[PDB]
Short mmCIF file of C-alpha atoms and ligand atoms in Angstrom, two decimals:
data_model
loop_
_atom_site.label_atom_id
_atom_site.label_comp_id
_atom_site.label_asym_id
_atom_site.label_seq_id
_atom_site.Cartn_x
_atom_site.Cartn_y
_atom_site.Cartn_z
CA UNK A 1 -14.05 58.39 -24.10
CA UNK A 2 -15.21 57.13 -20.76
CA UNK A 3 -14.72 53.49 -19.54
CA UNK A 4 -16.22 51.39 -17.02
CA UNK A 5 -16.39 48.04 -15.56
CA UNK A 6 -19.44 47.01 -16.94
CA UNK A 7 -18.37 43.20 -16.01
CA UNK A 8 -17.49 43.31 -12.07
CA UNK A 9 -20.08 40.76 -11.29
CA UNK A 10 -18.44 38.20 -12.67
CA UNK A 11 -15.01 38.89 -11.73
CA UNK A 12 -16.65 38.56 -7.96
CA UNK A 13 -18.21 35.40 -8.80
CA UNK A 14 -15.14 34.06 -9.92
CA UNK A 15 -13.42 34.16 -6.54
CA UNK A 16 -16.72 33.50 -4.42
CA UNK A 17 -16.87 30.15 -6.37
CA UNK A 18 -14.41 28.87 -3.97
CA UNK A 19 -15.26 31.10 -1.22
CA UNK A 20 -18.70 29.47 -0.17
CA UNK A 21 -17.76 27.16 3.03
CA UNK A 22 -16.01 29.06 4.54
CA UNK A 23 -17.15 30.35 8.41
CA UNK A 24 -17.65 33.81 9.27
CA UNK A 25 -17.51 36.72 7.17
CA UNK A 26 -14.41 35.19 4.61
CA UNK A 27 -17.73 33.91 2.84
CA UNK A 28 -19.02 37.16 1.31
CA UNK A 29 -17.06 40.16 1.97
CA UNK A 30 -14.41 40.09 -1.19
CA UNK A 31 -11.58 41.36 0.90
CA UNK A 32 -11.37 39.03 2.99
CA UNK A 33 -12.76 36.06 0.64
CA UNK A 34 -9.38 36.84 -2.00
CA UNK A 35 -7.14 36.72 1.55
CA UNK A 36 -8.82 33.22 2.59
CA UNK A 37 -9.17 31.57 -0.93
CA UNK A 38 -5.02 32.61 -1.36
CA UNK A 39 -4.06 31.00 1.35
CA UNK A 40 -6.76 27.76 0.27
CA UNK A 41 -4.78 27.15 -3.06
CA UNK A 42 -0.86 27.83 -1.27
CA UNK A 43 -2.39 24.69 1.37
CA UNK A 44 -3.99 22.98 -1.08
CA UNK A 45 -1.18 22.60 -3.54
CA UNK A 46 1.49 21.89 -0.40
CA UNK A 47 -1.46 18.82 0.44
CA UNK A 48 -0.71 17.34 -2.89
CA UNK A 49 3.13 16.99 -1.92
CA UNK A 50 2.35 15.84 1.99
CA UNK A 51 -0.13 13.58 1.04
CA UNK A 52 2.44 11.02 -0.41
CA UNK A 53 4.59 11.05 2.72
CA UNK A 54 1.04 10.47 4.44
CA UNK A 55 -0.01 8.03 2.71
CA UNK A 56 3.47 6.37 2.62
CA UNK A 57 3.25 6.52 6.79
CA UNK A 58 -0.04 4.58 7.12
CA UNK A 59 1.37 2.04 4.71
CA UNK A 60 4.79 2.00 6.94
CA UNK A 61 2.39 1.47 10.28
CA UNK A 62 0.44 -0.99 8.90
CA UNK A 63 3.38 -3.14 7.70
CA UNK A 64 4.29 -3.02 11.19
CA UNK A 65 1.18 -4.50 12.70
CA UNK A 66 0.95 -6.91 10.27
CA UNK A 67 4.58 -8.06 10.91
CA UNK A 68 4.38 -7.66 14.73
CA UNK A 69 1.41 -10.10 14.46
CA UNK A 70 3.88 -13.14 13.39
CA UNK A 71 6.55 -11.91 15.62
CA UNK A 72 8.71 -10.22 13.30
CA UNK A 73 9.41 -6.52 13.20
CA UNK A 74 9.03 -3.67 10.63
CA UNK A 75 13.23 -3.74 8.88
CA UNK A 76 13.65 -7.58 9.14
CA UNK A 77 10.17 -7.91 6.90
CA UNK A 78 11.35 -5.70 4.45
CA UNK A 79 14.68 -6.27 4.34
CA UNK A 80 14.30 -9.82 3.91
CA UNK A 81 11.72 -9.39 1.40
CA UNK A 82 14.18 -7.74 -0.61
CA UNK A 83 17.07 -10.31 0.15
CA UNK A 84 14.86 -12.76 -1.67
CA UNK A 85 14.15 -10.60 -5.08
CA UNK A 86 10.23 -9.79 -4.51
CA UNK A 87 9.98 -5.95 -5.43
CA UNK A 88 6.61 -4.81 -4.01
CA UNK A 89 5.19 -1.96 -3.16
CA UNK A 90 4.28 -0.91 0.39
CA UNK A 91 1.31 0.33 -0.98
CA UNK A 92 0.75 -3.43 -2.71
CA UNK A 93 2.30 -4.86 0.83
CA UNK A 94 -0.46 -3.14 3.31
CA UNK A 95 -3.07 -4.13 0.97
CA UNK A 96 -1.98 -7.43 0.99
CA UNK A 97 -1.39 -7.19 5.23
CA UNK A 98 -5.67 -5.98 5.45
CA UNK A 99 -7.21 -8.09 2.29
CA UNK A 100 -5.33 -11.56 2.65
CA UNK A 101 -3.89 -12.06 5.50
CA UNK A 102 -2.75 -15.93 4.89
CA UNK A 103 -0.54 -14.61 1.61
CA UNK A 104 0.79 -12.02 4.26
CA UNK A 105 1.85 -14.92 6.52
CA UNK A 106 3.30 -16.61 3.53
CA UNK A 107 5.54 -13.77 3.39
CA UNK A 108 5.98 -13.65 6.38
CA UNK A 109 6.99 -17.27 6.54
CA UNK A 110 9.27 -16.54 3.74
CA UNK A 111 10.93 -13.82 5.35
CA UNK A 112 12.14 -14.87 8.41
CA UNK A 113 12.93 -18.15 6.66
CA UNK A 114 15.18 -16.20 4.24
CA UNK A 115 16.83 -14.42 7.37
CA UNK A 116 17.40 -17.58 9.29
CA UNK A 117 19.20 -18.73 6.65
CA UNK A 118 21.15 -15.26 6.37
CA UNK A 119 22.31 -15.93 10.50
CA UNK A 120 23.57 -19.19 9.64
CA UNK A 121 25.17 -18.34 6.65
CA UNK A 122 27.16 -16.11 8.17
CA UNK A 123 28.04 -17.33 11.56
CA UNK A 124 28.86 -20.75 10.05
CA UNK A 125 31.94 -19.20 8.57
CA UNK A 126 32.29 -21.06 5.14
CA UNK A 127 31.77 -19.79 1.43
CA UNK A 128 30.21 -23.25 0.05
CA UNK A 129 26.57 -23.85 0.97
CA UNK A 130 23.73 -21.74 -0.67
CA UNK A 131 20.61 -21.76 1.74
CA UNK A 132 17.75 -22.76 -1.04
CA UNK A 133 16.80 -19.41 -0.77
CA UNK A 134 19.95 -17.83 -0.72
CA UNK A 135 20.53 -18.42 -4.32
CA UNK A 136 20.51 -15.49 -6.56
CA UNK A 137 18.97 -14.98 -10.14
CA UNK A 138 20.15 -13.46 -13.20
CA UNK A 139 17.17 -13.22 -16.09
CA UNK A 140 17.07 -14.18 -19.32
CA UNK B 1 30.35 -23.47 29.88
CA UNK B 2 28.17 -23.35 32.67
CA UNK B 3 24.87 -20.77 32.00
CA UNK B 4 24.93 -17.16 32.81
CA UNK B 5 22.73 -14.89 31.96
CA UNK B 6 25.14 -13.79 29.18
CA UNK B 7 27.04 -16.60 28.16
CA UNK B 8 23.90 -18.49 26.48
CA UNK B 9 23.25 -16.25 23.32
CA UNK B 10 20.21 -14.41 23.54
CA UNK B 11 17.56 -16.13 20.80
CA UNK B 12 16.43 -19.26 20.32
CA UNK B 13 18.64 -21.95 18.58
CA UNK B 14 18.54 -22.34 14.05
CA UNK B 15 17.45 -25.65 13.06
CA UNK B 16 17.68 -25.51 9.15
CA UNK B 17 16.87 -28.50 7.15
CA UNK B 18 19.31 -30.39 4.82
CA UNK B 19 19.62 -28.87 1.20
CA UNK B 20 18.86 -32.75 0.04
CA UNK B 21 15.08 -32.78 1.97
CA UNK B 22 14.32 -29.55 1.02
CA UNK B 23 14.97 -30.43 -3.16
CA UNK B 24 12.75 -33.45 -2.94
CA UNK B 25 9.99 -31.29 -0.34
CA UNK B 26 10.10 -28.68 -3.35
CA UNK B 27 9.77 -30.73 -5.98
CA UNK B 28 6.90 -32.55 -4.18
CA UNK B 29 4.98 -29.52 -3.06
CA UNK B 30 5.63 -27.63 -6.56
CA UNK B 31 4.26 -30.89 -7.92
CA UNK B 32 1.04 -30.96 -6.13
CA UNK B 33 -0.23 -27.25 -6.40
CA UNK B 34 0.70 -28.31 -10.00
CA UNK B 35 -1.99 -30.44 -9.72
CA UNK B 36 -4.31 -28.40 -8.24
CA UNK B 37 -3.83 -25.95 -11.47
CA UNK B 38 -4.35 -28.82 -13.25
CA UNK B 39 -7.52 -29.80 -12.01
CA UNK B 40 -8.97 -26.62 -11.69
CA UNK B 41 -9.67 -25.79 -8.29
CA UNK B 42 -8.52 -22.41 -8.13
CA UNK B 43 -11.82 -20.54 -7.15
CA UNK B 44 -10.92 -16.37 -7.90
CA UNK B 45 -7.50 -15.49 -8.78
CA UNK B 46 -5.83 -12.18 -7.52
CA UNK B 47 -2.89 -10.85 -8.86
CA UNK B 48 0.01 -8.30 -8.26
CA UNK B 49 0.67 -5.95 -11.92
CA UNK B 50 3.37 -3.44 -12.33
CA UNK B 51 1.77 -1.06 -15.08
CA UNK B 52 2.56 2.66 -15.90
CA UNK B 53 4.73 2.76 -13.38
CA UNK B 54 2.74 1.35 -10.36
CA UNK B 55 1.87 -1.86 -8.90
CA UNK B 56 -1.64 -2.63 -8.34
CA UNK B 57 -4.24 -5.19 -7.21
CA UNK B 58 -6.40 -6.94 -9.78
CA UNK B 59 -9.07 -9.34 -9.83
CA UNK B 60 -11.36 -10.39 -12.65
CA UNK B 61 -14.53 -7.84 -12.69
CA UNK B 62 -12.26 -4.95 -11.40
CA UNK B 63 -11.67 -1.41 -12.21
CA UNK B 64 -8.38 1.10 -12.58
CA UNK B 65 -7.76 4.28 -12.66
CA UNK B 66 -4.48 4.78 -15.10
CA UNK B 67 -3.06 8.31 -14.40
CA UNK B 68 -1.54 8.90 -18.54
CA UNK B 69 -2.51 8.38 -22.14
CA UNK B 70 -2.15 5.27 -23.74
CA UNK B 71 -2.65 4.61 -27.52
CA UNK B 72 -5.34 2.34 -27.91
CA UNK B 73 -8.34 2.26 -29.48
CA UNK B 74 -11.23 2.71 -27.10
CA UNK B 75 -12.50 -1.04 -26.32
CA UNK B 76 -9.58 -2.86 -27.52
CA UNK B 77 -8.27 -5.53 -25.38
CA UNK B 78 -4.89 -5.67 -23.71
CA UNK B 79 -2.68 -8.23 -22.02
CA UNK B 80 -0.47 -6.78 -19.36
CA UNK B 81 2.88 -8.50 -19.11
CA UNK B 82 4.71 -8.10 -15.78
CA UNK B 83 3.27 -9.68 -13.25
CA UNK B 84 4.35 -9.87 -9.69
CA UNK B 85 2.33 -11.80 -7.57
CA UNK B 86 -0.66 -14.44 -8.10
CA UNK B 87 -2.80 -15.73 -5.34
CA UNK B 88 -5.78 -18.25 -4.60
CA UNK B 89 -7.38 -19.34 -1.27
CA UNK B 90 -5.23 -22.25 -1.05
CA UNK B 91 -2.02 -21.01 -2.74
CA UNK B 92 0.22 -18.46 -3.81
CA UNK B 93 2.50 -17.49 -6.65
CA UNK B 94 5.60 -15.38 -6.51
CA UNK B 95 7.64 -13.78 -8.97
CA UNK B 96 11.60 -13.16 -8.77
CA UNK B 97 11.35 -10.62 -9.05
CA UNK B 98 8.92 -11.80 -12.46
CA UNK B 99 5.88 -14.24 -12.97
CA UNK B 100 7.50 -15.82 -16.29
CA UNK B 101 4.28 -15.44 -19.26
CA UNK B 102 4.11 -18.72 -20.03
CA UNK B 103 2.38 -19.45 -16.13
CA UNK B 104 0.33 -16.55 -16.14
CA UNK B 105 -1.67 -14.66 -17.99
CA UNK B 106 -4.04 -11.45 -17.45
CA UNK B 107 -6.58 -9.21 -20.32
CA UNK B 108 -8.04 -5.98 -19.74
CA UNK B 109 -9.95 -4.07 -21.22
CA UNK B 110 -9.97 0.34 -21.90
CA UNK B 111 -12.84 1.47 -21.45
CA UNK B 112 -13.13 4.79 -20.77
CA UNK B 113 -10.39 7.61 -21.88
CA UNK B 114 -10.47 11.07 -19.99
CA UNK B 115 -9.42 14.26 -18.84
CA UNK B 116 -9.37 14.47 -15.09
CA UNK B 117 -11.09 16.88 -12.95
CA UNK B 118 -9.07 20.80 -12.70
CA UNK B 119 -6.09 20.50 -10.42
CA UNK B 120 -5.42 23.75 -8.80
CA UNK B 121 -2.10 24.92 -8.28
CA UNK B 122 -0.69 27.78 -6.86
CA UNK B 123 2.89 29.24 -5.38
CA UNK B 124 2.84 32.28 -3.15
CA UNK B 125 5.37 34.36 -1.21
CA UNK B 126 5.24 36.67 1.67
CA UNK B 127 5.35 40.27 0.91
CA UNK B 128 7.53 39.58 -2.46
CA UNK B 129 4.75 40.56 -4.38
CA UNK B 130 5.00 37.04 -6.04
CA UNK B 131 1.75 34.77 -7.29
CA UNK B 132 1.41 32.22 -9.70
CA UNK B 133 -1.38 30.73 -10.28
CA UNK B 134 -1.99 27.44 -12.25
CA UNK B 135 -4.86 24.90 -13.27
CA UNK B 136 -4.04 21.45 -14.49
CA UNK B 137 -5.59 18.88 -16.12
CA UNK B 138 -4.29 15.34 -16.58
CA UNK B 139 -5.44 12.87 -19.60
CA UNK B 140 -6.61 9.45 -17.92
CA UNK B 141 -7.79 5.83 -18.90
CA UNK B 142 -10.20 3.51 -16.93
CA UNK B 143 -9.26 -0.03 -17.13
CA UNK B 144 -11.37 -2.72 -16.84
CA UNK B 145 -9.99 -6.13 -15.83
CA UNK B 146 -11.69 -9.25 -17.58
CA UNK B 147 -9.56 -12.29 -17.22
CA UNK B 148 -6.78 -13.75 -14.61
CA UNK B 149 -5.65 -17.29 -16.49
CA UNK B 150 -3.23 -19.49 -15.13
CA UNK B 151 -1.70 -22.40 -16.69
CA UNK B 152 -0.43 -25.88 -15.73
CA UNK B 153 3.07 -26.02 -15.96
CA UNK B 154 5.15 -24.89 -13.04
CA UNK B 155 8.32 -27.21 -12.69
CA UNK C 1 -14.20 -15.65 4.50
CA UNK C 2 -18.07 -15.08 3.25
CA UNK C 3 -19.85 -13.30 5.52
CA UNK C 4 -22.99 -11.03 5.17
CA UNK C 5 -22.00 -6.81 4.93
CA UNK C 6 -23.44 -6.22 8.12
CA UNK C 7 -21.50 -9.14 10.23
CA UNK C 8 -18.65 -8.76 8.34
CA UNK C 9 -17.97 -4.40 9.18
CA UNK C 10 -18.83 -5.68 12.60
CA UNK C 11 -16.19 -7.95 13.30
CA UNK C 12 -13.51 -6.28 11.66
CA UNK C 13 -14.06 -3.34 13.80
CA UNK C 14 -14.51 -5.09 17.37
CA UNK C 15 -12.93 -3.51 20.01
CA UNK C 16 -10.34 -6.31 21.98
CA UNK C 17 -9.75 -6.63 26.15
CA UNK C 18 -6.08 -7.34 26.55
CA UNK C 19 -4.88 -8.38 30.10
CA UNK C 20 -1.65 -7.68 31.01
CA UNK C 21 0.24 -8.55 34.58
CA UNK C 22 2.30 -5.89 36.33
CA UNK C 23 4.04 -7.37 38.96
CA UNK C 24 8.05 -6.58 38.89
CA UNK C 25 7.87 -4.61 35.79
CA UNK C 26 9.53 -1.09 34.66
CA UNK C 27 6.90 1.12 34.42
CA UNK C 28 8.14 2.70 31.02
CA UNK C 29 8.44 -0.64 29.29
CA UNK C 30 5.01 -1.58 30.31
CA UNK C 31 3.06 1.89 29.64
CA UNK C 32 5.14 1.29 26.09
CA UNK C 33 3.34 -1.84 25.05
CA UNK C 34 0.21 -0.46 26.62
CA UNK C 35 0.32 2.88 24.75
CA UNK C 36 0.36 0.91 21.60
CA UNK C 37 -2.43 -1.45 22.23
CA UNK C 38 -4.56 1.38 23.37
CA UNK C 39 -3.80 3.60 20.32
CA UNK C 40 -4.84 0.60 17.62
CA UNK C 41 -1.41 0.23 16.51
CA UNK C 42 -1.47 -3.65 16.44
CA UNK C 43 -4.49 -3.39 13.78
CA UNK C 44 -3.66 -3.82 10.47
CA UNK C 45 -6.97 -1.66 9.33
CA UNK C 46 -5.70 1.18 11.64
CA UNK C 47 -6.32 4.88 10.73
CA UNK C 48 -5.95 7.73 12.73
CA UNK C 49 -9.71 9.01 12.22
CA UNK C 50 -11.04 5.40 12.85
CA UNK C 51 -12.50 4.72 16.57
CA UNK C 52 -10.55 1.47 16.47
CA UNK C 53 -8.47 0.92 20.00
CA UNK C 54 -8.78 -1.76 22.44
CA UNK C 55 -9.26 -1.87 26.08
CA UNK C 56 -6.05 -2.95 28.35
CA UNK C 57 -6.77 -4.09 31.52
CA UNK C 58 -3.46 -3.82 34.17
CA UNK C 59 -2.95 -5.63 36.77
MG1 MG D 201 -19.59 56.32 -23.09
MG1 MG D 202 6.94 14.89 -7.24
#
């Protein structure tokens, strides 16, 4: 009992799918179409794990002109943003620093308010006063 | 003292208002964007959510892209709870680190519940003989945002 | 803030001359500032694939 391949076609097609922009001869030969479609998914799923540093970068950068803008740089803004209990996102932050830019200043404001405060906390050498935004929450 | 270069410390000087001031300013300026809730002249609220994980952007009319499954009947209409920032032309709202419920409030709506697009995955190694290949797909909702409310009392 | 679609892409986008005196200054300190005006890194709508730099004029 003799057996073929009767379904080859198909099997071809299956890898050509993904083969089709390619330049030069990686978009028909299927030699050289498995080789470059291989290498296409290894890139493609190390993308999905760069992208998020990437994306993370820009974010990082554009805090940093947004900050620079009101004279304040990248690690005081964020820094101080923390000191003051507002959790958000550099993703939520740069959105904020491109799509309302008088909120940003409001942080801004807040920011180096908050570290102002932190300076002469701590150079005026005494425990007792608690700059109004110095003061720290507990929730109920 | 006389002034060197060095001497003089390096920054301008801290002038930082008396605690006394600053509880009456507060209580003043808290007082009047009270009033402005009151009246009404808020024109389009925008507002910072934490949901599923994320934070996100949201205005009344909007659309999001939820990356799980949530149990919900399709159409139903939700109220998310945490909510970070709120913001108008003229003011701004901010949580620590928590917009309390009874100043805020903001519905959505499901509409649309998914299965995302074929995520390709693969792991390779050189001359190890050693492929895997893997497609994924991910279950997703749509939300619509209908409604950013915000209420009177801030104190 | 309302501005038509056409108006509005435009000046977002506009390309900025920044002037910037020389005289007594270290070279490295100066092309620093410089490089980052130049590049669009002062832009908060700044991507790497967007034309977006300004001009910087030394004197
Ligand atoms: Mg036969
Ligand atoms: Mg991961």
């Amino acid at each position: 009992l003799r057996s073929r391949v009767t379904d080859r076609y198909w099997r071809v097609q299956e890898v050509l799918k993904h083969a089709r922009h390619f330049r030069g001869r990686k978009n028909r030969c299927y030699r050289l179409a498995v080789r470059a479609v291989t290498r296409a998914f290894v890139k493609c799923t190390r993308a999905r794990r760069l992208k998020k540093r990437s994306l993370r970068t820009l974010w990082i950068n554009r805090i940093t002109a947004a900050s620079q803008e009101h004279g304040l740089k990248y690690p005081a803004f964020i820094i101080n943003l923390i000191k003051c209990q507002v959790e958000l996102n550099r993703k939520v932050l740069a959105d904020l620093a491109i799509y309302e830019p008088k909120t940003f200043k409001s942080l801004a404001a807040l920011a180096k308010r908050r570290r102002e405060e932190g300076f002469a906390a701590a150079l005026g050498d005494g425990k007792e006063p608690d700059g109004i935004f110095s003061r720290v929450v507990q929730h109920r | 003292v006389p002034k060197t270069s060095l001497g003089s410390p390096p920054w301008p000087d801290i002038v930082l208002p008396d605690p006394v001031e600053e509880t009456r300013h507060h209580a003043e300026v808290v007082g009047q964007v009270n009033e402005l809730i009151a009246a009404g002249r808020y024109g389009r609220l925008f507002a910072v959510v934490h949901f599923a994980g994320h934070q996100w952007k949201v205005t009344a009319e909007d659309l999001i892209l939820i990356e799980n499954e949530l149990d919900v009947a399709c159409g139903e209409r939700i109220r998310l709870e945490k909510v970070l920032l709120v913001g108008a032309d003229n003011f701004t709202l901010l949580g620590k680190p928590l917009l309390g419920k009874e100043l805020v409030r903001v519905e959505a709506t499901v509409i649309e519940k998914t299965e995302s697009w074929p995520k390709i995955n693969m792991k390779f190694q050189k001359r190890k003989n050693y492929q895997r290949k893997r497609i994924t797909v991910n279950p997703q909702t749509v939300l619509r945002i209908n409604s950013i409310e915000i209420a009177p009392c801030l104190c | 803030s309302s501005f038509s679609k056409a108006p509005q892409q435009w000046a977002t986008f506009a390309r900025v001359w920044y002037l910037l005196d020389g005289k007594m200054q270290p070279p490295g300190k100066l092309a620093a500032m410089a490089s980052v005006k130049l590049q669009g890194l002062h832009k908060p709508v700044y991507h790497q694939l967007s034309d977006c730099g300004d001009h910087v004029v030394i004197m």
